[PDB]
Amino acid sequence: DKNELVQKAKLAEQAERYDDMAACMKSVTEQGAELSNEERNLLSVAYKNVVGARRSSWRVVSSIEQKTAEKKQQMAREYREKIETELRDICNDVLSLLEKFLIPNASQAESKVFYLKMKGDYYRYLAEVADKKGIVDQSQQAYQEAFEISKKEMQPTHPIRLGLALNFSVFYYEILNSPEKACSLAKTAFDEAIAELLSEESYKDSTLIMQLLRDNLTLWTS
Amino acid sequence: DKNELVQKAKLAEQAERYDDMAACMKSVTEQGAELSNEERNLLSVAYKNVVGARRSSWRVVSSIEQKTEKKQQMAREYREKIETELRDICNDVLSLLEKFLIPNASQAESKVFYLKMKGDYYRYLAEVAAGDDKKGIVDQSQQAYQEAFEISKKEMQPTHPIRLGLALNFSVFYYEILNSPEKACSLAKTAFDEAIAELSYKDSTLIMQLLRDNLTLWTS
Amino acid sequence: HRYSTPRSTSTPNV
């Protein structure tokens, strides 16, 4: 059973059918056993794609609503609301998986940081469309606990620790409107990883996140 | 209301939500008025995106299905589920063409455009048909293209992008579905040469380049 | 913009 659902999720991924992929990995998670690295990466990939499509459509429609008659504005508004409901339902589904299964079963610091980052991300997507104060604080609290754990248990070049710093820096910039704290957090993460330059299997992923941290710093300084 | 359905379809398009876009254009069509050129292009774009997603997925999974026992059956079943979606999309489009678009089309340009679309959607059914229901599907695609082909040769300039795109797709039908590369090459080269002889020009020269790219691929 | 963590041809759309 669990095996078959994982193989169906992989098939759906190759077919670029991410809603199918996410439904497979949701069912795996609901079986209540701690996920392997491979399973949690499938779950993360599936939902990031599913929510990413809705966030992209929301930005396009939200903006059309803001640049607009009255009949046309209202159409855009109602369509924005429809996409928002899809996006909210997806975030709530992931956050429910995180509360009920993933975070309670996480037996290692690496996975606890992984899931607390995910929780930070999905409240941050809720914050993008938000009630907003409470959502923002839930995001900030998940990131902050992830951040403390990763600093205590992970090397500064660990891709999960770097990816957490990238996303928490984006949260400070874009959600909290605290650009100086965003730049401070991103520059420290980049500089500490440069100082300790890593195993074979992580070269590519750590350094790719380093490039994104520096690209954000370039953008936010220029 | 037509006009507001059309606005919704443009917004769906902007949001890259092509299933929403197609549902809006299906509703516009089902109001029974002849579609404007803008509406016709919206309908075509929406469904070409919606069916294109399933054809792309089908090709991936089908490929895995063949290149592999419990795992072969799982791929087979998934391929079947994608095929059902694809077949339902094509059937939807083909009903709209039969019931509303082809009978109401009052200009040769429209009539060619929709008969080509009918050739196309039976061709996508032909790509996934197996067993006994294939020869009849292939024949329906061929007959639709042939009708479109005879009207376009009579009524349209050889450089008209609709006439050129019909030659492009009909030549693909002969190559990929009828396994008739000589007929495919001859149809594509004639369409190219006839447009050269009598030389929307951006669309026209783009499709001429595609005609000659297929000739190069099929010769090579 | 800012970043967070990550055969024959037929007729195309016009």
Structure tokens at A63: 């903006």
Closest to A216 measured CA to CA, from A176, A165, A175: A165
In angstroms, rounded to a whole number, what is the distance separating the alpha carbons of residues A87 and A60? 14
CA C13, A50, A209: angle at the middle one, nearest 5? 100
CB C2, CB A216: distance < 8 Å: yes
Q: Does A208 touch chain B (CB under 8 A)?
A: no
CB A57, CB B17: distance < 8 Å: yes
Structure tokens at A58: 């929301």
Resolution in A: 2.0
For residue C3, which residues of chain A lie inside 8 Å, CB to CB?
166, 170, 212, 215-216
Structure tokens at A150: 């990763």
What b/e readout covers B143-172, taking b as 16+ CB neighbours within 10 angstroms?
A: ebbebbbebbeeebebbbbbbbbbbbbbbb
Chain A residue with the nearest C-alpha to that of C5:
A163
Distance of CA A118 to the CA centre of its chain: 5
- Say if the Cβ atoms of C5 and A166 lie within 8 Å: yes
Give domain B1-220's CATH superfamily: 14-3-3 domain (1.20.190.20)
Q: Which amino acid is at B127?
A: E
CA atoms within 13 A on the CB side of A9: 25
CB B8, CB B28: distance < 8 Å: no
The backbone torsions φ and ψ at residue B142, rounded to the nearest 5 degrees and listed phi first, read -55, -45
Q: Which amino acid is at A93?
A: D
Structure tokens at A219: 């953008």
Structure-derived torsion over alpha carbons of residues A171, A177, A180, A185, reported in degrees to the nearest 10: -10
Distance of CA A30 to the CA centre of its chain: 20
- Say if the Cβ atoms of C4 and A170 lie within 8 Å: yes
In angstroms, rounded to a whole number, what is the distance separating the alpha carbons of residues A142 and B213? 54
Cα maximum dimension of chain C: 38
Please provide the DSSP assignment of chain A as one string. Answer: -HHHHHHHHHHHHHTT-HHHHHHHHHHHHHT-SPPPHHHHHHHHHHHHHHHHHHHHHHHHHHHHHHH---HHHHHHHHHHHHHHHHHHHHHHHHHHHIIIIIHHH--SHHHHHHHHHHHHHHHHHHHHH--HHHHHHHHHHHHHHHHHHHHHHS-TT-HHHHHHHHHHHHIIIIIS--HHHHHHHHHHHHHHHHHT---GGGHHHHHHHHHHHHHHHHHHH-
For residue B10, which residues of chain A lie inside 8 Å, CB to CB?
none
CA distance C12 to chain B (A): 9
- What is the count of residue pairs from B and C with beta carbons less than 8 Å apart? 31
Q: Does B79 touch chain A (CB under 8 A)?
A: no
CB B138, CB B126: distance < 8 Å: yes
In angstroms, rounded to a whole number, what is the distance separating the alpha carbons of residues B207 and B148? 17
Q: Does A72 touch chain B (CB under 8 A)?
A: yes
- The reply to whether CATH 1.20.190.20 applies to domain A1-222 is yes
In angstroms, rounded to a whole number, what is the distance separating the alpha carbons of residues A146 and A108? 12
The backbone torsions φ and ψ at residue A157, rounded to the nearest 5 degrees and listed phi first, read -95, 0
| Cβ contacts of A83-90, under 8 Å, gap ≥ 24 | A83/A54, A83/A57, A83/A58, A83/B15, A83/B17, A84/A58, A84/A129, A86/A54, A87/A51, A87/A54, A87/A55, A87/A58, A87/A125, A87/A129, A88/A126, A88/A129, A90/A47, A90/A50, A90/A51, A90/A54
Structure tokens at B100: 């509303």
| Count of positions (residues) in chain B | 220
**What one-character DSSP code corresponds to residue B198?**
T
**What one-character DSSP code corresponds to residue B99?**
I
Q: Does C14 touch chain B (CB under 8 A)?
A: yes
Q: Does C7 touch chain A (CB under 8 A)?
A: no
Residues 117-176 of chain A with CB under 8 A from chain C are: 121, 163, 166-167, 170, 173-174
Closest to A62 measured CA to CA, from A90, A81, A85, A86: A81
| Cβ contacts of B210-213, under 8 Å, gap ≥ 24 | B210/B168, B210/C9, B210/C11, B211/B164, B211/B167, B211/B168, B211/B171, B212/B188, B213/C9
| Experimental technique for the deposited model | X-ray
